[PDB]
Amino acid sequence: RMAHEGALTGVTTDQKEKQKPDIVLYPEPVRVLEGETARFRCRVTGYPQPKVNWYLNGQLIRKSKRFRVRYDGIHYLDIVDCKSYDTGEVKVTAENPEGVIEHKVKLEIQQLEHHHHHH
Numbered sequence: 587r588m589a590h591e592g593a594l595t596g597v598t599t600d601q602k603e604k605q606k607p608d609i610v611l612y613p614e615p616v617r618v619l620e621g622e623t624a625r626f627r628c629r630v631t632g633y634p635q636p637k638v639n640w641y642l643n644g645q646l647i648r649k650s651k652r653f654r655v656r657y658d659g660i661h662y663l664d665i666v667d668c669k670s671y672d673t674g675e676v677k678v679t680a681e682n683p684e685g686v687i688e689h690k691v692k693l694e695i696q697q698l699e700h701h702h703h704h705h
Contacts, residue, residue, distance in 0.1 A: 607632040607685035620671035620697040643674025
């Protein structure tokens, strides 16, 4: 009968609406020929600025300022350093005090730029 019985926890703590975790990536494999710049997006969502990391070609931690990267939920993979001719695998994981996620995708980089042709 008495709605009041305990202190009400503030909401302005950081967010207003609590959503369920869920990372965003490229489930669709992508292939590019050497000499072409590749663009992929890797962000997280459902939870405020979590602590996630990723693996390029299966390698954790990518160079800073050289490539657009910010460890705060935002990670873009831009390869134009001219070294692309190498097929590998990308795997992204995420951490959260209340959740953990994982997704595997395959990226293979061929070579050249011109497609085959015939009669």
